[PDB]
Amino acid sequence: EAEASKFVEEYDRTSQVVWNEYAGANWNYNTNITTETSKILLQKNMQIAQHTLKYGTQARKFDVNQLQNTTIKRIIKKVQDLERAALPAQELEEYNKILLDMETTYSVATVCHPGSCLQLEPDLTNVMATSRKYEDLLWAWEGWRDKAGRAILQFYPKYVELINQAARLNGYVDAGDSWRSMYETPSLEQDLERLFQELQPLYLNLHAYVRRALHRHYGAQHINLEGPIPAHLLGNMWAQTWSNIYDLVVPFPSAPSMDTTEAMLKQGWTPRRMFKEADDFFTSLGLLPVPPEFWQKSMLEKPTDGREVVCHASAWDFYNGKDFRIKQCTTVNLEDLVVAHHEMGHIQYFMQYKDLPVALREGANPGFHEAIGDVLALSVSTPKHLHSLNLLSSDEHDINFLMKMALDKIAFIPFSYLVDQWRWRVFDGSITKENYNQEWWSLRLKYQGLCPPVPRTQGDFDPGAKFHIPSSVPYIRYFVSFIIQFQFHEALCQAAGHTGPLHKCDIYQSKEAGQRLATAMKLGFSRPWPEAMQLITGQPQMSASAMLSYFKPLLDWLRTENELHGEKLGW
Ligand SMILES: *[C@@H]1O[C@H](CO[C@@H]2O[C@@H](C)[C@@H](O)[C@@H](O)[C@@H]2O)[C@@H](O[C@@H]2O[C@H](CO)[C@@H](O[C@@H]3O[C@H](CO)[C@@H](O)[C@H](O)[C@@H]3O)[C@H](O)[C@H]2NC(C)=O)[C@H](O)[C@H]1NC(C)=O
Ligand SMILES: C[C@H](N[C@H](C(=O)O)[C@@H]1CCCN1C(=O)c1ccc(N)cc1)C(=O)N1CCC[C@H]1C(=O)O
Ligand SMILES: *[C@@H]1O[C@H](CO)[C@@H](O)[C@H](O)[C@H]1NC(C)=O
Ligand SMILES: [Cl-]
Ligand SMILES: [Cl-]
Ligand SMILES: [Zn+2]
Incomplete structure (x- = not known):
């Protein structure tokens, strides 16, 4: 027990130092993507992995069943998870390089007229937020996917294989199980299912009303009042928040709102x-x-x-x-x-x-x-x-403000829900590289009621065009x-x-x-x-x-x- 206390104390002092150095290098790369910042980052990756391996190996020799203090128990149990540092060194290096290559690809992608080249922030963001022309919105939406999402596809299968391999080497069945574990809630999936089902009245009623307003602006030939909404019309690249199309959907145009x-x-x-x-x-x-x-x-x-x-x-x-x-x-x-x-x-x-x-x-x-x-x-x-x-x-301004809030908070409920429904099924093997994109659009339809404005083709990897996917950040x-x-x-x-x-x-x-x-x-x-x-x-x-x-x-x-x-x- 005293051995267990000393171990956590040593883990703590040595982790501060090592994570500080890593944080520094990761910072310098994120704020200055160069060959050299990349190199130093990939090196500090190997350094923190050595730390993790050293302390994680030692942590696993403690039987935490046999430990009294519950804080020490819990720290030790957490250090027994080596995450990617469980991989053999060759896979670890390839894994870190894959991550880096994915982030970099996403963060430097541009979309160009044949003309000047637009970056995601602020140019394409501003196009999705402010344009009201169907074909310009389509250009930005499709272009971003062609440039960022397709370019991530070549990395993704190997990412999945390595992150799952790390997960299993830490005792999980796959990376998605590992991510879900972080809530320490075995009824998580069902709990979140019921939560999403409770917001269905609000989301479907919001969806239908916005669909009607889009029908009015973009024309009956582009909006099916009984179908999914095309994904490029909601004022945001991923249609995850809809508050940028407040102008099209204002409940009380009589109560004008401030720009x-x-x-x-x-x-x-x-x-x-x-x-x-x-x-x-x-x-x-x-x-x-x-x-x-x-x-x-x-x-x-x-x-x-x-x-x-x-x-x-x-x-x-x-x-x-x-x-x-x-x-x-x-x-x-x-x-x-x-x-x-x-x-x-x-x-x-x-x-x-x-x-x-x-x-x-x-x-x-x-x-x-x-x-x-x-x-x-x-x-x-x-x-x-x-x-x-x-x-x-006024009642009028009130319903307007609630509309403005619902376009951000209610609309994002099915988006935020679906992202890891898709990744959990990628991780567990029930979606493969053969149907990544098709399963992504089935969930886009099923949960958000959206459809792609242009049919997707082989080679498309639309999830790749959302930050958290290449960055491997749970959603x-x-x-x-x-x-x-x-x-x-x-x-x-x-x-x-x-x-x-x-x-x-x-x-x-x-x-x-x-x-x-x-x-x-x-x-x-x-x-x-x-x-x-x-x-x-x-x-x-x-x-x-x-x-x-x-x-x-x-x-x-x-x-x-x-x-x-x-x-x-x-x-
Ligand atoms: C189980 O062990 C935890 C952790 O113990 C702490 O870390 C160990 C690895 C050793 O280094 C221990 O010596 C060390 O205390 C115990 O939790 C700790 O308990 C103390 C209370 O005794 C907390 O101290 C407080 O600190 C605040 C703010 O700084 C002061 O204002 C308070 O007045 C008070 O002194 C300490 O925060 C707490 N540490 C953590 C991180 O939880 C825990 O008490 C122990 N349980 C049993 C079964 O005794
Ligand atoms: C812009 C916001 N940015 C993320 C974020 O802040 O979550 C960033 C990138 C990934 C996580 N994050 C962090 O900074 C972070 C650092 C430490 C933590 N312990 C947790 C997060 C975001 O994506 N968001 C915000 C809401 C929706 C989501 C999105 O834009 O898709
Ligand atoms: C950016 O990175 C280069 C290459 O590592 C480095 O020499 C330089 O000092 C950094 N510059 C900035 C703008 O911080
Ligand atoms: Cl998409
Ligand atoms: Cl999470
Ligand atoms: Zn955040």
């Missing part, structure tokens, strides 16, 4: 301003400010020196309890303001659990890490708070996040003494809400996630009832509206 983009730009907002407001919200709650070093080291806008960066927004823990950063190619708009909050939530979790042993430095489950920033950003998005930031100035966390963040907003709003509809709550400055969040985050991964759930919400389960309560007046409005139009929900 928040123009307002930000006109009022001189910058990426730094955006992050300072998120920092403000957190300290308003009496949560932690980000350190001075955060502001000197983060990369908050896309470099202008022609350097290739990984633009995709991400939060960075350097594992030393002091160095925390964000790397985002921030655009000045409300969409990225929300992303800035998102990322700031991941910084706040890193700062909150910085005194735990590094093995327990994660969220209660990955969903909790994604949820923190979003919970704040729900209050940021209210008319009350946007008014205060000078970005906005079910986002589904868990979207459910639980409403539970957290509901409990925080109650802690804050809010009364009346949940959607009017704004927890800004609430020290009561902050303390609930802080005590949960301070747990890191030290206990099963139900305890952190119970600390925030007073009960231990995930539940869609808070999200349903938030959207209830919109659900009533959508049913009245869709009923009077005779919509046939579904496809």
